[PDB]
Amino acid sequence: MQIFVKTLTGKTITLEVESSDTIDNVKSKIQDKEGIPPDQQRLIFAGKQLEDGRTLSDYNIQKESTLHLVLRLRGG
Amino acid sequence: AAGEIDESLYSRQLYVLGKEAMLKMQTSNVLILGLKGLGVEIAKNVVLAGVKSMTVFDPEPVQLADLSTQFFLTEKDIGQKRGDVTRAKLAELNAYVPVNVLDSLDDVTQLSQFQVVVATDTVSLEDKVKINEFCHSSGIRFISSETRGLFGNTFVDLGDEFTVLDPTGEEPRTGMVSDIEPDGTVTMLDDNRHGLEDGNFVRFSEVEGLDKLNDGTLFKVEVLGPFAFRIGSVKEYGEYKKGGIFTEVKVPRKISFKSLKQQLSNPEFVFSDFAKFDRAAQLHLGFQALHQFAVRHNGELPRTMNDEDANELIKLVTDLSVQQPEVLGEGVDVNEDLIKELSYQARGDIPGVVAFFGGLVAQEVLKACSGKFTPLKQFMYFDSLESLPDPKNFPRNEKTTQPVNSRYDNQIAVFGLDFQKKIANSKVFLVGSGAIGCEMLKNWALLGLGSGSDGYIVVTDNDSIEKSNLNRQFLFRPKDVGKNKSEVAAEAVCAMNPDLKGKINAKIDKVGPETEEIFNDSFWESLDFVTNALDNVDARTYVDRRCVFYRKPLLESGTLGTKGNTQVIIPRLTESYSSSRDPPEKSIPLCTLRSFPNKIDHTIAWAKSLFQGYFTDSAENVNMYLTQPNFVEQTLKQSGDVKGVLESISDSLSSKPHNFEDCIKWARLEFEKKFNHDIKQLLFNFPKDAKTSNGEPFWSGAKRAPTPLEFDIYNNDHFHFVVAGASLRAYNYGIKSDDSNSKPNVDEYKSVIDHMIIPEFTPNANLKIQVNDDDPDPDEIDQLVSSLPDPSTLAGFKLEPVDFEKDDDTNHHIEFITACSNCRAQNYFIETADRQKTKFIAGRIIPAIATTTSLVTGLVNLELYKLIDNKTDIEQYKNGFVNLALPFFGFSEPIASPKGEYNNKKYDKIWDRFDIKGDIKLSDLIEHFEKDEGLEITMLSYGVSLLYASFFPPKKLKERLNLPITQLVKLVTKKDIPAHVSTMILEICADDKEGEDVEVPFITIHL
Ligand SMILES: *NS(=O)(=O)OC[C@@H]1C[C@@H](n2ccc3c(N[C@H]4CCc5ccccc54)ncnc32)C[C@@H]1O
Ligand SMILES: [Cl-]
Ligand SMILES: [Cl-]
Ligand SMILES: [Cl-]
Ligand SMILES: [Cl-]
Ligand SMILES: [Cl-]
Ligand SMILES: [Cl-]
Ligand SMILES: [Cl-]
Ligand SMILES: [Cl-]
């Protein structure tokens, strides 16, 4: 199935995944595309931050679901 | 005579919006209808950003309850008109923006003089529809917004034809090309990602063999992988030979909006929070219901906490859904609890919600004026119902929520009187008083936070107010420049709400390790919570550590242009800021900088370092050598670069200039060295046509073959390099400029330089030049020491070092770096950059604007409500993430603190610790752990130094076991513990009851 990852700069990445895939795995795939180390990735979906070692199924992530890859900013 | 922008005021905003956008903003007249909280907040942000004119319309009399969120009203203004009374205070925010009052809007025709019209909560739906219809059909941009307690919305309608010039504000993607196949497949050089999306457009330059592919034509991108994209067939243009750089181009997009009338019955939503997406339709109905209600009840909203009126609202909503089952979709029920709360809270005026919509709508006004960023299309609804406290602690009914005839009445309307008093008796520490800081203090003035006899606010900030701050630090005026941020901010908000007179302790101390004597155990322990308003990571990390140590909640936020974020750190519940890594600042390889640049970022880096060395380091080194008798002996045995330092002194003292003319000469000789001789040297080792072991050309990809510069005073960069170099050199040596009262004169410099012998270049045959950071680096120091003059021949000779100040245009710094970078850019055929861009990179300036700052601060004060109620259900808290450019809002439940176990005992790996009362003896500490915790201490340490280990032999145990921890540290470190220290953190390792090593909490010793 297909999910989307939207970045904070508006970019849309598309991923090929299965419901049983670990978040670890989705981060792995995002690293292949963007070059972002899994440990620097903050993924959020439907009000939860996605944690390493849980599955896509655990967060109720369906086909066509959109995850957001977000950041913290140092200005103030 | 306008069409130019004040860089010294707009500096940081300018890096968000750009010059074109701001020139359009400077031709736009904006009209704001209603000047309660929402209106004044929108107006403030728009006036700060600098539009051509601001006009405000609110003929209503000021009432006490209006002060809930209208920070420019005072009790003295009661009875007078909101518009009249606010006007003068908005004007003070930005002297370039006239602020006018519309007396009357009986004639809708008067709208034609404005380009954007904004309708706030004061305007009925009937009038919003009339006004929108007039605007839409006349080409006037229309935005509306409403807050009702913890709910809110915004609507955007920019007309039939609106063009977006830049959807995001991001730097266009760029990159180096190694191949272009005939079918259009573009492969990136090495392992560089293009970073494009399908349907981006690109242009090319330097692609040899495809002539007209470089002519500015755009190509649509088909992404093939991370390292390739396709542009359609290019066999028509020729055949690829080598080279090439691609550059993303943003193309214009035409979009159309619908009228409010159409969108009421058939809306397009943008979502504020995807966890709540089902609520958008419901609230859309609900907010229309409130207007229908008002029409039935002579313009009144539902009564605060009132069931009769809430049931009427639910009926009204159900009639809209039964009549049109297409806003909710087929077979979907009204959410009656949600609508009930909308009724209950309809009169509420909540500071954080107002701040959210104020920032948002203000940015939408700016988009509307400029075509910069993607507009909100077309409706967004929002709520922060999680901010409601538990009714078991703070019950809500008609009695607890009734007005008490105070400025807080429409906050009381939502939370109750009791909750509001707990806000006032809170004790808070605010770390920073800049952008977030000023917005924070305004929000706290509006909350009455710290205003009660048990409460206070401490705010500290160690900076003084600079001019570019005024663009988003709205509590500061031009005449406050040079004063301290915290002190001025504290005074400013006390005028806003006198309930804070003598309740804010404005400090000017730098938070960090050198101020723990001030910000000490007692200071921190006293607080209820801490809020960051900081501009750097290390400070956030430090406050985070201390919040963990003292077990205090922390409210964190940050911005970068239109992007922003909030984070909540709750003791015993969530992870802390330090728990997660952010992407680090990428470093440029050393060889790229020194010999093989290809981006202006590289030439600026190189030029900035040259600046340090020419005008800061070489002077500090001379001063050390003249004042430290042991300097040369010190340098010889504690420097990696010894020879650099000694030549820097020898050079500094043998070339001593006597006048400005000598400074000019020096600078012209440095031009020859850096942009002529060094380049001819690099080309001596690596000729234009040099090859490598494989037989492929040395200069390809990231390596651009340089040409030496032939000095040309008519060239701007060559001129300014010499002007700025000479003027800085003069400053070092205490010489007066011919420049220090007026402009540099070309003929004056020319007549010095024209009479100089410039020495011809001879190559050094033994210089190795490092091609990679992998590859290695490859007596006369006794001669260099012999060359140095005795410091007694230079009695009282100081060189004055330069201290980089990027925000003073008279000081030559950015002038130098810009010119020096660009001369190097000319060398390597890199596009030269201007002062504003060089200042951004050299100065590490963070793009910033008031819109994002208010909105993010708003969201922080919606989480603050949750601290006041001591919430322990992690699911109630929201970390936020925004980008107003898109616009995008997302939220996430904080991550729980990781937990552990030793023996049968669960513990928190961030928050839990062993508190030991007293300067305990080592033997008693080891025993306490086995007896009371089931733990066999295995190592015990204090910072770097090891105090006890189970492998110690008996001789060593005898020395240590009977010592108090302070004397034990004394034994090992040979330091006293200082007097001021009242706690000591000890790290331990331990075995559990099975004899297995287990991870365990740290120890705090309370002296
Ligand atoms: N966002 S803004 O308007 O550009 O600036 C807000 C800041 C807050 C205030 N500020 C910044 C840093 C501060 C510190 N301590 C820092 C300095 C370096 C460091 C290392 C380790 C720990 C802490 C710290 N203390 C107080 N105020 C600070 C200035 C500016 O307005
Ligand atoms: Cl621009
Ligand atoms: Cl213009
Ligand atoms: Cl006036
Ligand atoms: Cl109304
Ligand atoms: Cl920094
Ligand atoms: Cl610096
Ligand atoms: Cl300054
Ligand atoms: Cl820029």
Tab-separated table of N, CA and C in Angstrom, chain B residues 27-146:
chain	number	residue	atom	x	y	z
B	27	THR	N	2.333	49.046	-0.839
B	27	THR	CA	1.312	49.666	-1.676
B	27	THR	C	-0.111	49.225	-1.322
B	28	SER	N	-0.339	48.525	-0.203
B	28	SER	CA	-1.664	47.960	0.130
B	28	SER	C	-2.264	48.656	1.320
B	29	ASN	N	-3.518	49.097	1.191
B	29	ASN	CA	-4.271	49.651	2.319
B	29	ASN	C	-5.156	48.553	2.874
B	30	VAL	N	-5.086	48.375	4.191
B	30	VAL	CA	-5.786	47.330	4.918
B	30	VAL	C	-6.811	48.001	5.834
B	31	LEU	N	-7.964	47.359	5.945
B	31	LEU	CA	-9.056	47.848	6.768
B	31	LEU	C	-9.438	46.723	7.697
B	32	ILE	N	-9.500	47.024	9.006
B	32	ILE	CA	-9.904	46.060	10.010
B	32	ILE	C	-11.173	46.503	10.708
B	33	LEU	N	-12.175	45.615	10.676
B	33	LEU	CA	-13.494	45.859	11.245
B	33	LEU	C	-13.548	45.117	12.566
B	34	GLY	N	-13.662	45.900	13.653
B	34	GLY	CA	-13.700	45.377	15.010
B	34	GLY	C	-12.311	45.374	15.611
B	35	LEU	N	-12.228	45.986	16.777
B	35	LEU	CA	-10.976	46.204	17.471
B	35	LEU	C	-11.087	45.803	18.971
B	36	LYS	N	-11.745	44.659	19.175
B	36	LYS	CA	-11.534	43.834	20.338
B	36	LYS	C	-10.190	43.093	20.222
B	37	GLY	N	-9.916	42.176	21.140
B	37	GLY	CA	-8.705	41.369	21.086
B	37	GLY	C	-8.251	40.892	19.730
B	38	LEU	N	-9.112	40.148	19.047
B	38	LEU	CA	-8.767	39.616	17.738
B	38	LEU	C	-8.307	40.691	16.749
B	39	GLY	N	-9.073	41.765	16.653
B	39	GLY	CA	-8.777	42.851	15.743
B	39	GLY	C	-7.476	43.583	16.027
B	40	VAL	N	-7.216	43.869	17.302
B	40	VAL	CA	-6.022	44.631	17.677
B	40	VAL	C	-4.821	43.752	17.500
B	41	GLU	N	-4.974	42.455	17.740
B	41	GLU	CA	-3.865	41.525	17.567
B	41	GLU	C	-3.534	41.413	16.080
B	42	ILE	N	-4.546	41.249	15.222
B	42	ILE	CA	-4.316	41.237	13.783
B	42	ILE	C	-3.696	42.538	13.352
B	43	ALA	N	-4.266	43.648	13.784
B	43	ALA	CA	-3.760	44.966	13.392
B	43	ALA	C	-2.302	45.170	13.785
B	44	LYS	N	-1.955	44.845	15.033
B	44	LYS	CA	-0.580	44.948	15.531
B	44	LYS	C	0.416	44.256	14.617
B	45	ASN	N	0.111	43.005	14.285
B	45	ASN	CA	0.992	42.206	13.432
B	45	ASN	C	1.120	42.786	12.019
B	46	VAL	N	-0.001	43.275	11.493
B	46	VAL	CA	0.004	43.828	10.135
B	46	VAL	C	0.762	45.161	10.115
B	47	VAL	N	0.569	45.993	11.129
B	47	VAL	CA	1.248	47.276	11.191
B	47	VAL	C	2.750	47.080	11.352
B	48	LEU	N	3.141	46.129	12.198
B	48	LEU	CA	4.565	45.801	12.363
B	48	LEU	C	5.219	45.384	11.036
B	49	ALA	N	4.529	44.545	10.264
B	49	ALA	CA	5.035	44.072	8.958
B	49	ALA	C	5.150	45.150	7.890
B	50	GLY	N	4.329	46.193	7.998
B	50	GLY	CA	4.526	47.391	7.188
B	50	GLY	C	3.748	47.269	5.902
B	51	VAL	N	2.505	47.698	5.982
B	51	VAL	CA	1.671	47.902	4.846
B	51	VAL	C	1.579	49.389	4.641
B	52	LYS	N	0.938	49.789	3.562
B	52	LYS	CA	0.866	51.198	3.219
B	52	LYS	C	0.063	51.996	4.219
B	53	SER	N	-1.108	51.495	4.590
B	53	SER	CA	-1.895	52.135	5.632
B	53	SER	C	-2.705	51.073	6.351
B	54	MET	N	-3.037	51.353	7.612
B	54	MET	CA	-3.967	50.546	8.398
B	54	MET	C	-5.143	51.441	8.727
B	55	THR	N	-6.352	50.970	8.441
B	55	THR	CA	-7.540	51.668	8.876
B	55	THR	C	-8.348	50.746	9.798
B	56	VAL	N	-8.795	51.286	10.942
B	56	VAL	CA	-9.541	50.519	11.934
B	56	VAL	C	-10.935	51.112	12.073
B	57	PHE	N	-11.934	50.239	12.174
B	57	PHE	CA	-13.302	50.648	12.349
B	57	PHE	C	-13.842	49.930	13.569
B	58	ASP	N	-14.078	50.674	14.637
B	58	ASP	CA	-14.876	50.157	15.747
B	58	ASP	C	-15.475	51.306	16.535
B	59	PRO	N	-16.712	51.685	16.191
B	59	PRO	CA	-17.391	52.760	16.913
B	59	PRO	C	-18.037	52.371	18.266
B	60	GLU	N	-17.934	51.110	18.681
B	60	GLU	CA	-18.484	50.658	19.968
B	60	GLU	C	-17.775	51.236	21.203
B	61	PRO	N	-18.544	51.493	22.261
B	61	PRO	CA	-17.891	51.897	23.491
B	61	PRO	C	-17.092	50.760	24.167
B	62	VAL	N	-15.910	51.132	24.648
B	62	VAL	CA	-15.067	50.281	25.462
B	62	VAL	C	-15.806	49.945	26.743
B	63	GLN	N	-15.864	48.649	27.017
B	63	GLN	CA	-16.323	48.108	28.291
B	63	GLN	C	-15.220	47.320	28.983
B	64	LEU	N	-15.275	47.288	30.314
B	64	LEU	CA	-14.286	46.559	31.133
B	64	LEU	C	-13.965	45.155	30.596
B	65	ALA	N	-14.990	44.396	30.201
B	65	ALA	CA	-14.779	43.032	29.698
B	65	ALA	C	-13.916	42.963	28.418
B	66	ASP	N	-13.902	44.039	27.629
B	66	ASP	CA	-13.052	44.110	26.440
B	66	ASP	C	-11.565	44.004	26.758
B	67	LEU	N	-11.177	44.372	27.976
B	67	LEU	CA	-9.790	44.259	28.367
B	67	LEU	C	-9.273	42.818	28.471
B	68	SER	N	-10.139	41.808	28.401
B	68	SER	CA	-9.703	40.402	28.458
B	68	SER	C	-8.539	40.094	27.551
B	69	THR	N	-8.648	40.484	26.284
B	69	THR	CA	-7.546	40.286	25.323
B	69	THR	C	-7.071	41.533	24.554
B	70	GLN	N	-7.697	42.693	24.791
B	70	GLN	CA	-7.388	43.918	24.050
B	70	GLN	C	-6.350	44.690	24.870
B	71	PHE	N	-5.098	44.364	24.602
B	71	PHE	CA	-3.974	44.846	25.397
B	71	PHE	C	-3.744	46.353	25.293
B	72	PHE	N	-4.274	46.983	24.252
B	72	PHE	CA	-4.211	48.434	24.141
B	72	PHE	C	-5.359	49.197	24.784
B	73	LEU	N	-6.309	48.533	25.420
B	73	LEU	CA	-7.356	49.249	26.175
B	73	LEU	C	-6.939	49.380	27.637
B	74	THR	N	-7.462	50.398	28.318
B	74	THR	CA	-7.263	50.573	29.788
B	74	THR	C	-8.600	50.925	30.454
B	75	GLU	N	-8.684	50.806	31.769
B	75	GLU	CA	-9.933	51.156	32.453
B	75	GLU	C	-10.332	52.608	32.235
B	76	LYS	N	-9.358	53.494	32.106
B	76	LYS	CA	-9.600	54.897	31.754
B	76	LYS	C	-10.363	55.124	30.419
B	77	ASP	N	-10.224	54.199	29.474
B	77	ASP	CA	-10.874	54.289	28.160
B	77	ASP	C	-12.352	53.866	28.148
B	78	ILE	N	-12.863	53.361	29.258
B	78	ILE	CA	-14.248	52.903	29.317
B	78	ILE	C	-15.231	54.001	28.892
B	79	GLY	N	-16.186	53.648	28.027
B	79	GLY	CA	-17.175	54.602	27.529
B	79	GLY	C	-16.798	55.187	26.193
B	80	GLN	N	-15.502	55.376	25.936
B	80	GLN	CA	-15.033	55.885	24.641
B	80	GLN	C	-14.979	54.800	23.605
B	81	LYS	N	-14.811	55.189	22.352
B	81	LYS	CA	-14.882	54.237	21.235
B	81	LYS	C	-13.598	53.446	21.023
B	82	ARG	N	-13.706	52.134	20.832
B	82	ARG	CA	-12.512	51.290	20.733
B	82	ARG	C	-11.549	51.760	19.671
B	83	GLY	N	-12.080	52.021	18.479
B	83	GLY	CA	-11.312	52.533	17.348
B	83	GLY	C	-10.490	53.761	17.669
B	84	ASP	N	-11.153	54.817	18.137
B	84	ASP	CA	-10.461	56.084	18.513
B	84	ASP	C	-9.312	55.882	19.519
B	85	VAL	N	-9.620	55.145	20.569
B	85	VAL	CA	-8.699	54.907	21.684
B	85	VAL	C	-7.477	54.006	21.345
B	86	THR	N	-7.657	53.055	20.425
B	86	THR	CA	-6.598	52.140	19.973
B	86	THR	C	-5.633	52.763	18.921
B	87	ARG	N	-6.178	53.609	18.048
B	87	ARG	CA	-5.455	54.173	16.902
B	87	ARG	C	-4.041	54.643	17.206
B	88	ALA	N	-3.928	55.501	18.213
B	88	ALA	CA	-2.644	56.114	18.576
B	88	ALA	C	-1.619	55.097	19.063
B	89	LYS	N	-2.071	54.045	19.742
B	89	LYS	CA	-1.163	52.988	20.205
B	89	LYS	C	-0.668	52.082	19.080
B	90	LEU	N	-1.502	51.772	18.092
B	90	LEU	CA	-1.026	51.058	16.902
B	90	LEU	C	-0.025	51.880	16.108
B	91	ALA	N	-0.288	53.175	15.967
B	91	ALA	CA	0.623	54.073	15.226
B	91	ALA	C	2.060	54.036	15.739
B	92	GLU	N	2.188	53.900	17.054
B	92	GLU	CA	3.466	53.908	17.740
B	92	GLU	C	4.261	52.653	17.396
B	93	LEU	N	3.593	51.587	16.961
B	93	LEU	CA	4.266	50.356	16.585
B	93	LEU	C	5.149	50.464	15.352
B	94	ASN	N	4.812	51.336	14.399
B	94	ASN	CA	5.602	51.451	13.166
B	94	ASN	C	5.351	52.800	12.516
B	95	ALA	N	6.304	53.712	12.665
B	95	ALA	CA	6.135	55.066	12.171
B	95	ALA	C	5.987	55.139	10.641
B	96	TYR	N	6.399	54.120	9.896
B	96	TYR	CA	6.157	54.090	8.453
B	96	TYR	C	4.700	53.772	8.054
B	97	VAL	N	3.809	53.436	8.983
B	97	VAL	CA	2.465	53.001	8.637
B	97	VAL	C	1.468	53.918	9.272
B	98	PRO	N	0.807	54.758	8.482
B	98	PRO	CA	-0.254	55.558	9.067
B	98	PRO	C	-1.398	54.667	9.531
B	99	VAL	N	-1.971	55.009	10.684
B	99	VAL	CA	-3.118	54.299	11.217
B	99	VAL	C	-4.295	55.270	11.344
B	100	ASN	N	-5.376	54.987	10.617
B	100	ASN	CA	-6.563	55.846	10.518
B	100	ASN	C	-7.778	55.173	11.127
B	101	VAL	N	-8.769	55.998	11.450
B	101	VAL	CA	-10.039	55.547	11.956
B	101	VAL	C	-11.107	55.886	10.921
B	102	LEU	N	-11.891	54.873	10.576
B	102	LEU	CA	-13.104	55.026	9.808
B	102	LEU	C	-14.176	55.314	10.837
B	103	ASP	N	-14.904	56.410	10.658
B	103	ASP	CA	-15.904	56.806	11.638
B	103	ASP	C	-17.170	56.010	11.488
B	104	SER	N	-17.468	55.637	10.246
B	104	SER	CA	-18.762	55.112	9.885
B	104	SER	C	-18.641	54.227	8.665
B	105	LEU	N	-19.420	53.153	8.644
B	105	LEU	CA	-19.472	52.259	7.497
B	105	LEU	C	-20.899	52.106	7.006
B	106	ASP	N	-21.648	53.194	7.037
B	106	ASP	CA	-22.996	53.196	6.464
B	106	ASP	C	-22.966	53.006	4.965
B	107	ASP	N	-21.916	53.524	4.348
B	107	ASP	CA	-21.699	53.414	2.919
B	107	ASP	C	-20.678	52.288	2.621
B	108	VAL	N	-21.121	51.114	2.145
B	108	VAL	CA	-20.170	50.039	1.747
B	108	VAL	C	-19.200	50.441	0.650
B	109	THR	N	-19.605	51.391	-0.173
B	109	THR	CA	-18.753	51.992	-1.195
B	109	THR	C	-17.406	52.465	-0.708
B	110	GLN	N	-17.337	52.897	0.554
B	110	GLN	CA	-16.058	53.285	1.158
B	110	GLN	C	-15.023	52.184	1.167
B	111	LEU	N	-15.441	50.919	1.145
B	111	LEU	CA	-14.518	49.794	0.997
B	111	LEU	C	-13.574	49.850	-0.199
B	112	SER	N	-13.972	50.482	-1.295
B	112	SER	CA	-13.168	50.534	-2.526
B	112	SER	C	-11.793	51.110	-2.403
B	113	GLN	N	-11.574	51.950	-1.407
B	113	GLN	CA	-10.218	52.478	-1.143
B	113	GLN	C	-9.225	51.465	-0.504
B	114	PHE	N	-9.693	50.300	-0.056
B	114	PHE	CA	-8.839	49.276	0.573
B	114	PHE	C	-8.609	48.097	-0.373
B	115	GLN	N	-7.443	47.444	-0.262
B	115	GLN	CA	-7.083	46.243	-1.042
B	115	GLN	C	-7.374	44.969	-0.257
B	116	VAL	N	-7.250	45.010	1.070
B	116	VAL	CA	-7.653	43.879	1.892
B	116	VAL	C	-8.561	44.397	2.998
B	117	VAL	N	-9.712	43.739	3.198
B	117	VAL	CA	-10.665	44.071	4.249
B	117	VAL	C	-10.749	42.860	5.157
B	118	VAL	N	-10.652	43.071	6.473
B	118	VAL	CA	-10.724	41.992	7.443
B	118	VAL	C	-11.873	42.207	8.418
B	119	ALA	N	-12.755	41.205	8.550
B	119	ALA	CA	-13.945	41.274	9.424
B	119	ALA	C	-13.855	40.331	10.656
B	120	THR	N	-13.721	40.916	11.839
B	120	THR	CA	-13.534	40.172	13.061
B	120	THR	C	-14.869	39.798	13.700
B	121	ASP	N	-14.818	39.364	14.959
B	121	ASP	CA	-15.975	38.889	15.729
B	121	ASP	C	-17.088	39.921	15.923
B	122	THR	N	-16.774	41.203	15.733
B	122	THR	CA	-17.752	42.278	15.929
B	122	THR	C	-18.766	42.431	14.807
B	123	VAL	N	-18.568	41.723	13.694
B	123	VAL	CA	-19.382	41.904	12.477
B	123	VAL	C	-20.297	40.706	12.323
B	124	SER	N	-21.589	40.990	12.226
B	124	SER	CA	-22.608	39.975	12.090
B	124	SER	C	-22.428	39.185	10.800
B	125	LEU	N	-22.980	37.988	10.747
B	125	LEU	CA	-22.887	37.205	9.554
B	125	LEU	C	-23.592	37.920	8.404
B	126	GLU	N	-24.759	38.519	8.651
B	126	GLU	CA	-25.471	39.239	7.594
B	126	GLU	C	-24.575	40.281	6.922
B	127	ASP	N	-23.857	41.057	7.738
B	127	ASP	CA	-22.928	42.087	7.251
B	127	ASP	C	-21.640	41.517	6.642
B	128	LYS	N	-21.101	40.443	7.226
B	128	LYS	CA	-19.981	39.714	6.620
B	128	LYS	C	-20.347	39.251	5.215
B	129	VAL	N	-21.558	38.755	5.008
B	129	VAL	CA	-21.968	38.335	3.673
B	129	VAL	C	-22.120	39.544	2.715
B	130	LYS	N	-22.699	40.647	3.188
B	130	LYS	CA	-22.836	41.856	2.352
B	130	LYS	C	-21.462	42.393	1.975
B	131	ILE	N	-20.598	42.506	2.979
B	131	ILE	CA	-19.276	43.072	2.795
B	131	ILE	C	-18.463	42.154	1.925
B	132	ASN	N	-18.581	40.849	2.131
B	132	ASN	CA	-17.843	39.929	1.297
B	132	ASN	C	-18.283	40.024	-0.133
B	133	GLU	N	-19.580	40.047	-0.364
B	133	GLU	CA	-20.096	40.179	-1.730
B	133	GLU	C	-19.598	41.448	-2.430
B	134	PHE	N	-19.609	42.574	-1.723
B	134	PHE	CA	-19.052	43.800	-2.271
B	134	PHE	C	-17.572	43.623	-2.593
B	135	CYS	N	-16.796	43.079	-1.663
B	135	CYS	CA	-15.366	42.884	-1.889
B	135	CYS	C	-15.080	41.922	-3.051
B	136	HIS	N	-15.698	40.756	-3.020
B	136	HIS	CA	-15.487	39.751	-4.039
B	136	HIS	C	-15.764	40.278	-5.420
B	137	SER	N	-16.906	40.903	-5.626
B	137	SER	CA	-17.266	41.440	-6.931
B	137	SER	C	-16.513	42.705	-7.366
B	138	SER	N	-15.820	43.380	-6.457
B	138	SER	CA	-15.042	44.560	-6.762
B	138	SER	C	-13.577	44.288	-6.801
B	139	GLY	N	-13.111	43.050	-6.607
B	139	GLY	CA	-11.663	42.762	-6.547
B	139	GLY	C	-10.933	43.097	-5.258
B	140	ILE	N	-11.662	43.169	-4.158
B	140	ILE	CA	-11.079	43.466	-2.844
B	140	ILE	C	-10.929	42.137	-2.088
B	141	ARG	N	-9.789	41.931	-1.437
B	141	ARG	CA	-9.525	40.661	-0.761
B	141	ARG	C	-10.212	40.709	0.581
B	142	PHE	N	-10.858	39.602	0.950
B	142	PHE	CA	-11.670	39.528	2.151
B	142	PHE	C	-11.204	38.404	3.045
B	143	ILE	N	-11.032	38.700	4.321
B	143	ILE	CA	-10.708	37.693	5.306
B	143	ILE	C	-11.616	37.947	6.477
B	144	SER	N	-12.146	36.890	7.076
B	144	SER	CA	-12.880	37.033	8.305
B	144	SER	C	-12.340	36.076	9.366
B	145	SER	N	-12.619	36.394	10.621
B	145	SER	CA	-12.195	35.541	11.735
B	145	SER	C	-13.049	35.761	12.980
B	146	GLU	N	-13.222	34.722	13.765
B	146	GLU	CA	-14.021	34.792	14.972
B	146	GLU	C	-13.396	33.877	16.012
